[PDB]
Design an enzyme around this catalytic site. Structure first.
Site, PDB file in Angstrom:
ATOM      1  N   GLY A  72       0.808  -1.243   0.000  1.00 47.20           N
ATOM      2  CA  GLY A  72       0.000   0.000   0.000  1.00 47.20           C
ATOM      3  C   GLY A  72       0.835   1.286   0.000  1.00 47.20           C
ATOM      4  O   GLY A  72       1.770   1.418  -0.801  1.00 47.20           O
ATOM      5  N   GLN A  73       0.497   2.215   0.907  1.00 44.25           N
ATOM      6  CA  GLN A  73       1.250   3.463   1.147  1.00 44.25           C
ATOM      7  C   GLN A  73       1.557   4.186  -0.165  1.00 44.25           C
ATOM      8  O   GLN A  73       2.706   4.240  -0.606  1.00 44.25           O
ATOM      9  CB  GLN A  73       2.530   3.168   1.946  1.00 44.25           C
ATOM     10  N   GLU A  74       0.501   4.717  -0.785  1.00 42.49           N
ATOM     11  CA  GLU A  74       0.535   5.185  -2.182  1.00 42.49           C
ATOM     12  C   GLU A  74       1.352   4.173  -3.026  1.00 42.49           C
ATOM     13  O   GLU A  74       0.877   3.072  -3.313  1.00 42.49           O
ATOM     14  CB  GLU A  74       1.065   6.633  -2.265  1.00 42.49           C
TER      15      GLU A  74
END
Ligand SMILES: Nc1nc2c(ncn2[C@@H]2O[C@H](COP(=O)(O)OP(=O)(O)O)[C@@H](O)[C@H]2O)c(=O)[nH]1
Ligand SMILES: [Mg+2]
Length: 181
Positions: A72-74
């Site tokens: 995830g996490q941009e």
């Protein structure tokens, strides 16, 4: 009556002043920070280089372990790659109970492997949280991460219960041995 040794003394035998750089990666909640504190090998320091992205680190003599969450996490993938510089080994940690997020973990793992800077790394997998009822077998985590099909790199998948420090001697001993050649 018999007692384990401190990893401090284990690291003395294993690496003993040698320059080693390992990166320990995995999805959030896999058990990575738990492994760090369970090593009892020095203070852990953090740098948050962006308002989301967050890196931990520990050094003993000249062995450094650098730690972050992947997925995830941009997609902050470039912010990492600085931290792969002359890495000897990867520890990739997986939540063996989380059947749902393992495709993701395999994806992530597979992206670390294909990074140029990881061409010649020894690869340790902790199939963690093996204490949990109905978790994946270490073989099932091996299969899923595609370790069978693997380059010319030395690899090993290791059962762990990070909260009890179980599996950790075994994996690290493999890693240490593997790295000196
Ligand atoms: N049951 C079990 N829980 C674990 C194990 N390892 C870590 N945990 C728990 O999983 C959670 C996340 O661990 P943490 O080390 O913060 O994961 P990180 O995000 O990979 O740093 C915590 O609640 C830990 O106590 C394990 O082997 N078995
Ligand atoms: Mg953590």
């Amino acid at each position: 009556h018999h007692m384990g040794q401190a990893f401090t003394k284990l690291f003395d035998r294993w690496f003993g002043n040698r320059e080693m750089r390992v990166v320990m990666l995995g999805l959030d909640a896999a058990g990575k920070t738990t492994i760090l504190y369970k090593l009892h090998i020095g203070e852990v320091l953090t740098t948050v280089p962006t308002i989301g992205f967050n890196v931990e680190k520990v050094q003993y003599k000249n062995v450094v372990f650098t730690v972050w969450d992947v997925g995830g996490q941009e997609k902050l993938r470039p912010l990492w790659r600085h931290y792969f510089n002359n890495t000897d080994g990867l520890i990739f940690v997986v939540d063996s109970q989380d059947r749902d997020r393992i495709g993701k973990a395999a994806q992530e793992f597979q992206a670390i492997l294909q990074d140029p800077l990881m061409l010649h790394s020894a690869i340790l997998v902790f199939a963690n949280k093996q204490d949990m009822k109905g978790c994946l077998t270490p073989a099932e985590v091996c299969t899923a991460l595609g370790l069978s099909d693997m380059r010319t790199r030395k690899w090993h998948v290791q059962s762990s219960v990070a909260t009890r420090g179980e599996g950790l001697y075994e994996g690290l001993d493999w890693l240490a041995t593997t790295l000196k050649n």
